[PDB]
Design a protein around this ligand. Structure first.
Ligand code: HEM
Ligand code: HEM
Ligand code: HEM
Ligand code: HEM
Ligand code: HEM
Ligand SMILES: C/C=C(C)/C=C/C=C/[C@H](OC)[C@@H](C)[C@@H](OC)[C@@H](C)CCc1oc2c(O)c(OC)cc(OC)c2c(=O)c1C
Ligand SMILES: C/C=C(C)/C=C/C=C/[C@H](OC)[C@@H](C)[C@@H](OC)[C@@H](C)CCc1oc2c(O)c(OC)cc(OC)c2c(=O)c1C
Ligand SMILES: CCCCCCCCO[C@@H]1[C@@H](O)[C@H](O)[C@@H](CO)O[C@H]1O
Ligand code: FES
Ligand code: FES
Ligand SMILES: [Sr+2]
Ligand SMILES: [Sr+2]
Ligand SMILES: [Sr+2]
Lengths: 428, 256, 179, 428, 256, 179
């Protein structure tokens, strides 16, 4: 709710249109929103994500025109796309590596938010909608990965549908329902195709609410200091209109990102992937080096850290009369790691928005960042010593950060003082 | 199982400017045809691609002649008949011989270091090198630990990491001692098992390098197109980046 | 002056180019793929064909008619006068593009016993019904009412042309090679 | 537009939510819009259409979970859905007959608009967006019909892709592009599946703009007299809030419609269909009784009325040096019949909004309505005499109505006087 | 071709309350098995459905025994084997005999009047009646017009409308004079060609009516479920309509 | 009074019911279809199986292991004490649901040579690698690190149970009937 200037019908076509459907007015008020002048490069990832969503959707629709969702034809059909379809090879690689770009970008987008308190009031809804988008993105990418029907596809599907089989009582049922039968088979591939096509639109719809949400509150900036709302006058001292100032910075950033992205796709399209998915699904044999998609590794690491021998698991197994064994504990830990991140707005008790002015916070935050990288890295290692320990410590730190450290720092930290205005900070 | 050492062969096609060597591919196709094909198939490879640009690029008539050796089953007729360039190479004749259509991509030869992926980042995934190494890795004498306990029907191979290993060859913890393991594939090559027309050398080393390049092409027939598309995209974007930078620079100048 | 104006214009220009470069392939993936483009030629054994019988065979995904015409079919065909035909072009790939729709110019043989044509209506694609159907002793297209005579020439309806004749020729005594 | 009271946060959850994302406020202002009190039963079709869109989308997603878009498996897969899938038979029939309900409803929706001048200023945008929806609906239903891969499916696909082959010069190219090859084959079925899935979302997006559009101007009513905007006072004499007054008769109407709909689906699910589509696609043989889907018949009739022997065609063929033969003329006439309907806002020159107060208009309008029914009925008849004549006269009247009769009536008609207010009319 | 006259048989399953007659279906299955099956297949019908409710409802063991007569080629084995209830009836053994799985739906017996569809609206689509009529429509003597010109390999049938007709039987305009036309299917039935266990009558008339009911079931095995679902939906909606009407009435009362 | 309140109540009530009636089938279509539900039984010829050899066969879309154990396999299996196991239940459908995970309770024969079980990890579904793999001379699941001993009992990792044993019985000299 920043004070600024609203749209004015000039042309005749404009006035005619405006008295019937104020769509040009809305576009204008959206493209002309006053944005803090001090945003830095870490504010470009939202645009990279919007682009990725569009990229994934158009290349997806196209791939779906040549793809056959049937166990006897799925893999052959992806090879037909690669060898026969005009530009098929490039479209396939763009969709595949696009998934990676999509995640590299959300993780940077997410951590940017964790650091500057972009989730703090009044931005909780923006944050929650974003969390929903994140869950959808994961479900979408998982189903997409199953479509090729390669080895990683089949076993990854077996394992992920297995997660639901771990829920006590109703579990076996939910798993049978997701599979459409006793095992991962054609009925499974068929429904995953339909859902892989549907979810991206749900995401698009959520992204719409996401944009509306941050537009309602105005963007946060690196200082955590809001834009002055008292008068157009000072508000302008703090901002510049989104168009063309930021629209251009964003498009420029996007071009640089796409430069690297296309270099990857053109020169090392298979680097971020798993060689075993170039082997046809074999229901009678699991590859020795099965490993999840990199953007899934950290959560995967948390899950397998919890074996029957872990003390907290043993305590849990005892105290719950066995309902909660390691299997279910690992599943809870994994979904729980995502859930605590969703709750951060209510776990961070500090009233200081930007972590730029929080000396103790900066330490735990960077430990969290390093922890994420460590988790990702251990996920690709074996379960033997010392990886088993590293994964436990990394998982421990993750839950510690959200459930213990953040609520404590709130009452214990001595925050440095922030500028009194964005203007102030900008000139500096 | 695990990951191992692969001889780092410098293939013409590696590097952003790498490209297939048409004659090597042709030689490789002969090796595949005269040796490998007896057990391994290439079910996803349309014979006619032997004619397309960026590969062996054989004249359509030769390809048409070539397809004749294959005795295919007609999708209507049902009765058998000779092969047409529109047919795919056949399935593996030997039930346990894996399909070679995608092999150069379904194996990595460079791993780590420390599981960091930095090795591949600079060396590639290593599928053709891996294939080369396996063809090249059958030594005459088995490593010592196994001397008297070689599984029957298997052969020791330096590069193969997913095979079985005699108990007498695993350490205190069960980890194998040998660099490689036992593979169900008997050594395929043997110096000059193939007579190259142009008199090129047919040393096990040469053939292995040729058939490996061929298999890389069979797996990524669009390699060159992909890389050409890459340069193109990079050029557009490099230009567009510079222009957007200047535009960005000029636009903000009127503020800070 | 036009230093900054040129930039903004050169910029938008590069954009447009990159955009088009992305759009073309999204369009072109829908064009025939390499497996399809492998347009073969086929052989048809025609030894079991008595006169008054039409053989329908698939070629390039469309039907091809091979009728061994009767005397009545040939008589009626030859009886029509060029200037009475809706389409006067022979539409025969085996002869000159300018040839005229005379019955003789529509068959493979001089006796005009072998009528070989695409059983693809020139209006919107349906396959016309043979067995001497229609108002001209030929074929009748049930899709929108086109009638063709015994030489496969359009005589009525919305179809603009005569059923095309593909490259075809007897490769021997009882075998015709299409394409 | 119309004076109304606004939303006010009451609960705590409400005020918390409202200061972050005013979504509840928006829903309220939408559900509370003041609506003319005099709307009659012809204002229920928009809701029937919204329901149909949702019905088609959910049953579609579900069907796509068991359907295989491949020529060797497509038909078998629809039979598998019918015989094996739990409730499959009912879901299939609901989707199929849902298409018919969808069209029955748009035609009533469209004619309602043609009669009350709901397309007249300031409602032109609402009308144009609606026309776009209509085009999408037809393309969507056409592609869906091809999925089963039955006889009607294959030949209907051959013919409709053939339409584009009729465009001079570029035509053969566009047709090859749509087909992905020299004939209707797997590449065609495969891309139709992807597009059949995609279009419904485009329609949903357009419907959103459609709703926004009529919300911007306010609904039209049977008198063509706008709601008084001068004061909340009188505005209320003319209206009642959408919720719950209209929401309830709409839901009531919908229940009655669905009653008939389910009776159809339960007792005569195959009545509105073609028996030949229960025969597998045969690329070498066109059924003798091939006939389009009923909701396509009228436009089909217009198209085949134009044979080489029609005078207007011969004139056009002469005047265009043979570029416009019957083939292309029929295609232009058919798309043109849709285009003139889209232009009605600019062809109807009368300043009187509702045709209730247009004595001469009433006559031509009902002739148009009868004409539509006649066209539909002739489409299913043979091309022999007298049907060939009937189709020509019916087609003639169709273009006459929009291109001649409406522009003339504008200057020639003596319009009866309409009530001065909606309230006046309501009390009567 | 065109449309014709079909004997209007009153089948138990017609009408909103119609339901299949389990014994008739069983008899029909015998006719199909003993007669039709020699040429016609039912490739979309899983044998096991002979057990499901709403159809013949044969005991699983009988069905399992029944499936034994067909000789199926196993999907991985490639080698032949006896039939299992999980197999579908076979494809038509006679190349030009159409598949009968969906025949009762792939045909309409009631047309018009005047192409208005009012006939079906009150009589149904007429597929089983059509099938009955065809089985029932082979007369011993061909109509006179054709007496000397009967196409060879064909048989005159009163109900069949898509067959060829001798020139001597078309009017001045080429339209056929006969009620029917020539079909490539020789009269399949003949009184008591099938021995019903319970001694039910096997007159061509009876068998035709039974096999027709059977084929209706083979095409719409969920006919009964569909109709049950229909009544249900109608009842909910009839109730809900009345309630919404009252609610609507009460709500507006405070205005008009 | 509650005349009109009851109506509005009964109305919304009917709605909810109709709604649920529509929702359930949208959910249930995803449950196993009739072709899937036709869960058969299969026969496995086991005459070519020497000891030390595992046969992997598909059943209900999942792998089933048939190992003819060696003496070493049998000794090591019999040497484990019930109280040393992670899961003490036999998970054998061929015997009492309460049976104990003794090696004798894990084989089909008294001699304990025939180990027949679902090659489906009880953690999240992967098929464990055999050939005497892992830290207990049995199988090793590469998905999350579960180890099973030579009787297919879980000894380490996140898997909560022993590999299940399906209805299985030698139908004769060299044939086992699963299911
Ligand atoms: C021809 C020179 C030839 C090539 C090339 C070749 C390659 C090859 C590879 C790369 C593998 C896969 C190894 C892996 O899993 O990483 C492989 C495997 C097998 N082969 Fe082979 N092979 C060539 C030739 C032959 C011939 C002539 C035979 C049959 C006599 C043969 C057989 C096999 C078999 C069996 C395997 C399976 C190995 C295993 O998993 O134990 N090969 N080959
Ligand atoms: C939310 C954006 C999307 C993401 C994150 C995504 C992700 C993926 C991934 C990870 C794969 C596997 C790639 C591979 O390794 O082969 C895939 C495959 C596929 N996706 Fe998507 N996808 C998205 C949107 C879409 C849409 C909208 C469609 C359908 C219109 C689609 C259609 C397909 C198809 C057909 C495949 C199979 C071909 C292939 O394997 O490349 N995708 N997708
Ligand atoms: C494709 C999915 C996503 C898209 C398209 C998207 C897009 C955007 C955009 C355009 C912005 C504004 C520009 C910026 O600050 O970067 C933004 C801001 C934000 N996003 Fe996202 N985002 C996505 C996912 C997420 C996720 C997963 C989260 C965290 C769970 C998230 C949290 C936020 C937050 C907190 C802000 C700050 C808003 C503010 O400054 O007021 N977003 N997002
Ligand atoms: C997806 C199909 C469509 C849906 C869901 C839809 C929905 C609606 C709804 C809910 C209304 C308001 C209530 C009513 O008057 O019934 C409406 C009004 C209207 N619709 Fe549609 N419509 C559709 C298609 C069309 C089409 C094809 C046209 C004409 C080409 C059209 C033209 C209009 C017009 C002119 C109005 C009246 C606007 C006013 O009163 O100000 N609609 N539509
Ligand atoms: C815009 C609303 C839609 C319309 C008008 C529509 C129309 C149709 C039609 C006419 C058919 C053929 C029905 C038959 O006679 O068998 C069909 C089939 C189909 N539709 Fe849609 N559809 C719609 C939305 C969707 C959506 C959103 C999906 C989701 C993918 C979908 C998936 C299918 C599938 C899989 C089939 C083939 C199976 C069948 O024949 O029932 N449809 N559709
Ligand atoms: C219709 C069915 C649906 C919609 C199911 C949706 C599930 C959605 C979840 O996202 C919300 C889920 C994907 C998400 O859990 C939060 C991931 C982080 C799970 C991480 C994951 O990946 C693996 C993987 O990729 C593999 O590949 C071969 C293999 C795996 O074991 C070897 C794993 C694995 O062990 C885990 C935990
Ligand atoms: C990739 C997407 C594509 C290619 C979309 C194309 C959309 C095209 C139009 O939608 C806007 C089109 C459906 C619409 O024309 C306005 C209809 C009224 C066409 C009417 C139509 O139906 C036929 C039909 O259904 C048939 O079935 C067996 C058979 C047909 O000949 C016998 C016809 C036919 O002769 C006509 C004119
Ligand atoms: C409220 C609207 C109710 C409409 C009821 C229509 C009853 C249709 O009843 C039909 C019969 O007419 C038809 O002959 C047989 C064929 O097997 O199938 C029945 O379901
Ligand atoms: S396609 Fe033959 S008359 Fe139209
Ligand atoms: S599925 Fe076997 S260890 Fe997890
Ligand atoms: Sr190298
Ligand atoms: Sr004339
Ligand atoms: Sr009857």
């Amino acid at each position: 709710g920043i004070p600024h200037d609203h749209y004015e019908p000039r042309t005749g076509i404009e006035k005619w249109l405006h008295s019937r459907l104020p769509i040009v007015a809305l576009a204008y008020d959206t493209i002309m929103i006053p944005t803090p002048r001090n945003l830095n490069w870490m504010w470009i990832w939202g645009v990279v994500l919007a682009f990725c969503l569009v990229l994934q959707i158009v290349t997806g629709i196209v791939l779906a025109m040549h793809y056959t969702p049937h166990v006897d034809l799925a893999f052959a059909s992806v090879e037909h796309i690669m060898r026969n379809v005009n530009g098929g090879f490039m479209l396939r690689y763009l969709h595949a590596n696009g998934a990676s770009l999509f995640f590299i970008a959300v993780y940077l987008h997410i951590f940017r938010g964790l650091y500057y308190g972009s989730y703090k009031a009044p931005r909780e809804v923006t944050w929650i909608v974003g969390m929903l988008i994140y869950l959808a993105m994961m479900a979408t990418a998982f189903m997409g990965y199953v479509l090729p029907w390669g080895q990683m596809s089949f076993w990854g599907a077996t394992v992920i549908t297995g997660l639901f089989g771990a829920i006590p009582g109703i579990g076996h049922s939910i798993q049978t329902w997701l599979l459409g039968g006793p095992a991962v088979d054609n009925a499974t591939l068929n429904r995953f195709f339909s859902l892989h096509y549907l979810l991206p639109f749900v995401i698009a719809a959520l992204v719409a609410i996401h944009i509306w949400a941050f537009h309602s509150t105005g963007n946060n900036n690196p200082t955590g200091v809001e834009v002055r709302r008292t008068s157009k006058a000072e508000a302008q001292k703090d901002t510049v209109p989104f168009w063309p100032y930021f629209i251009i910075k964003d498009v420029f950033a996007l071009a640089v990102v796409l430069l690297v992205f296309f270099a990857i796709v053109g020169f090392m399209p298979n680097y971020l992937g798993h060689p075993d998915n170039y082997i046809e699904a074999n229901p009678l044999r699991t590859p020795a080096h099965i490993v999840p998609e990199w953007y899934f590794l950290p959560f995967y690491a948390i899950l397998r850290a919890f074996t029957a021998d872990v003390w907290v698991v043993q305590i849990a197994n005892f105290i719950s009369f066995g309902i909660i064994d390691a299997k279910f504990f690992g599943v809870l830990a994994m979904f729980g790691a995502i859930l605590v991140m969703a709750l951060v707005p209510w776990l961070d008790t500090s009233p200081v928005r930007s972590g730029r002015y929080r000396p103790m916070f900066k330490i735990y935050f960077w430990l969290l960042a390093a922890d994420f990288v460590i988790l990702t890295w251990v996920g690709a290692q074996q379960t033997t010593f010392p990886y088993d320990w590293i994964s436990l410590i990394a998982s421990a730190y993750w839950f510690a950060y959200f459930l213990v450290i953040l609520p404590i720092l709130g009452a214990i930290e001595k925050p440095v003082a922030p500028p009194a205005t964005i203007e102030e900070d900008f000139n500096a | 199982a695990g990951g191992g050492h692969v001889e780092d062969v410098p293939f013409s096609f590696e590097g952003p400017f790498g490209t297939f060597d048409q004659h090597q591919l042709q030689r490789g196709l002969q090796v595949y045809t005269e040796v490998c094909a007896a057990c391994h198939g290439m079910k996803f490879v349309p014979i006619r691609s032997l004619s397309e640009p960026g590969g062996p690029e054989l004249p359509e008539d030769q390809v048409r002649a070539y397809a004749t050796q294959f005795t295919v089953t007609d999708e209507e007729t049902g009765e058998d008949r000779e092969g047409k360039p529109t047919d795919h190479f056949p399935h593996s004749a030997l039930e346990n011989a894996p399909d070679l259509s995608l092999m150069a991509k379904a194996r990595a030869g460079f791993h780590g270091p420390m599981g960091t992926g930095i090795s591949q980042l600079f060396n590639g995934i290593g599928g053709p090198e891996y294939i080369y190494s396996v063809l090249t890795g059958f030594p005459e004498e088995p490593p010592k630990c196994a001397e008297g306990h070689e599984p029957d029907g298997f052969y020791y191979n330096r590069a193969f990491q997913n095979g079985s290993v005699p108990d007498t060859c695993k350490d205190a913890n069960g980890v194998k001692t040998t660099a490689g393991s036992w593979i169900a594939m008997p050594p395929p090559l043997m110096d000059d098992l193939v007579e190259y027309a142009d008199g090129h050398d047919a040393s096990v080393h040469a053939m292995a390098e040729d058939v490996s390049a061929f298999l890389m092409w069979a797996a990524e027939p669009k390699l060159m197109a992909r890389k050409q598309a890459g340069f193109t995209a990079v050029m557009f974007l490099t230009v567009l980046s510079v222009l957007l930078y200047l535009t960005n620079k000029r636009l903000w100048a009127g503020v800070k | 002056g036009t230093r900054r104006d040129f930039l903004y214009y050169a910029t938008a220009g590069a954009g447009a180019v990159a955009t088009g470069a992305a759009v073309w392939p999204l369009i072109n993936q829908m064009n025939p793929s390499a497996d399809v483009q492998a347009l073969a030629s086929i052989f048809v054994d025609v030894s079991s064909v008595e006169p008054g019988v039409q053989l329908t065979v698939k070629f390039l995904g469309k039907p091809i008619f091979i009728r061994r015409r009767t005397e009545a079919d040939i008589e009626l065909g030859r009886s029509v006068q060029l200037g009475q035909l809706v389409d006067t072009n022979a539409r025969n790939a085996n002869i000159d593009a300018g040839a005229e729709a005379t019955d003789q110019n529509r068959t493979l043989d001089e006796a005009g016993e072998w009528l070989v044509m695409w059983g693809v209506c020139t209006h919107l694609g349906c396959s016309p019904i043979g067995g001497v159907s229609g108002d001209f002793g030929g074929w009748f297209c049930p899709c929108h009412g086109s009638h063709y005579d015994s030489a496969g020439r359009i005589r009525k309806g919305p179809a603009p042309e005569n059923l095309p004749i593909p490259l075809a020729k007897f490769i021997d005594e009882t075998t015709i090679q299409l394409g």
